[PDB]
């Protein structure tokens, strides 16, 4: 969201996001289906599938995104550049 006013930026971003929704497949509706290793630009993400009740042991942004998605049990380690957008 880009704007001179913070509330304008909030409105813009939270309105533009709903039109760009993904669908994230969740194993048993609580965790990812398998371990995920990726490197987007200079940011390495290593996500490990975890059993029920394990909780979200992830970077805080990942915790927020997982709560939004509907993921409750997962581990995640971020390495390299930790630029939030990346």
């Amino acid at each position: 969201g880009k704007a001179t006013d913070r509330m304008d930026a909030f409105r813009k971003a939270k309105n533009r996001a709903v039109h760009h929704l993904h669908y994230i497949e969740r194993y048993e509706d609580h965790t990812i289906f398998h371990d995920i290793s990726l490197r987007f630009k200079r940011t390495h993400i290593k996500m490990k599938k975890q059993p029920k009740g394990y909780g979200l042991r992830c970077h805080r942004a990942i915790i927020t995104i997982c709560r939004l998605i509907g993921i409750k049990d997962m581990y995640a380690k971020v390495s390299g550049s930790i630029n939030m957008l990346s």
Binding site: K48, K49, Q50, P51, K52, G53, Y54
Partner: protein
């Protein structure tokens, strides 16, 4: 002669009666969890894995042996009357040699009066736990085995849990083990919860107790209701085997008791609820005719 609990025919009958519900046998334990591992299997591989799970379930279901109550120990090794009054506390000497079996270990007690007697069974188990701590056993007897707590467990319908705790805490021939198993069997019979022990290693023990006490009425009723006719026939045959001189056994010997006829004969003779048993058998016959043709 009478057949022992460990006889081959008894084991076969009890194993068949217990059932082999894999789901119940391997119900997901509420324990520390690691992430699950996945395999890609053909139909043949899946069948082979299922059969291996069946073998594991049988090994796990291997029934505990039924042992008569252990005789109390009152042997005295030496009356050293000189020591009288030299102390005011028992000394409990345990042989902690690694190789000796726990039922051959020498656990003696030097009393304040100077007597050097063998340790009672309770002291034997206590010291063996102290010096060879077994998993799941506690030295001081857990309070769960008090009557009120046992009743709470029964009301919650945790008979399998009670039996597991009893087995872990006490020895098969222990007085407490015997009492708790009999109380659990009594509660299961009274409240008609026979299905709890099915597909568990304690069903055979429960059935053996019921047969020995000649109260198979409720178990047969439940089996007929659950249309376990083969199991009911096996149970009646086992009851006659363990009571050859019984009137029901004599009637079966006389007549052609070779099937549901066995259940009918037992309901007629030596069945305290014979009328109800035959009513349930009539209901099952109606069920059978409802799909025979």
């Amino acid at each position: 002669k009478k057949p022992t609990f460990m006889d081959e025919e008894v084991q076969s009958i009890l194993t068949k009666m217990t059932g082999l519900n894999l789901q119940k046998t391997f119900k997901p334990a509420i324990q520390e969890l690691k992430p699950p591992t996945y395999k890609l299997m053909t139909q043949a591989q899946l069948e082979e894995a299922t059969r291996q799970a069946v073998e594991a379930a049988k090994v796990r279901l291997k029934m505990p042996p039924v042992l008569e109550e252990r005789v109390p120990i009152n042997d005295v090794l030496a009356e050293d009357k000189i020591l009288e009054g030299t102390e005011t506390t028992k000394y409990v000497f345990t042989d902690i040699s690694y190789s000796i079996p726990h039922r051959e270990r020498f656990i003696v007690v030097r009393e304040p009066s100077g007597t050097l007697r063998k340790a009672s069974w309770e002291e034997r188990d206590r010291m063996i736990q102290v010096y060879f701590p077994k998993e799941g056993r506690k030295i001081l007897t857990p309070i769960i085995f008090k009557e009120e707590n046992l009743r709470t467990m029964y009301s919650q319908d945790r008979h399998v849990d009670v039996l597991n705790l009893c087995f872990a805490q006490f020895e098969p021939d222990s007085t407490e083990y015997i009492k708790v198993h009999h109380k659990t069997y009594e509660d299961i019979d009274k409240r008609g919860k026979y299905d709890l022990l099915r597909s568990t290693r304690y069903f055979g023990g429960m059935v053996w107790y019921f047969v020995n006490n000649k109260k198979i009425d409720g178990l047969l009723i439940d089996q007929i209701q659950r249309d376990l006719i083969d199991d009911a026939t096996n149970l009646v045959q086992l009851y006659h085997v363990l009571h050859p001189d019984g009137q029901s056994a004599q009637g079966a010997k006389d007549q052609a008791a070779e099937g549901i006829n066995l259940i009918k004969v037992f309901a007629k003779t030596e069945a305290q609820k014979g009328a109800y048993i035959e009513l349930t058998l009539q209901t099952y016959q109606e069920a059978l005719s409802r799909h025979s043709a």
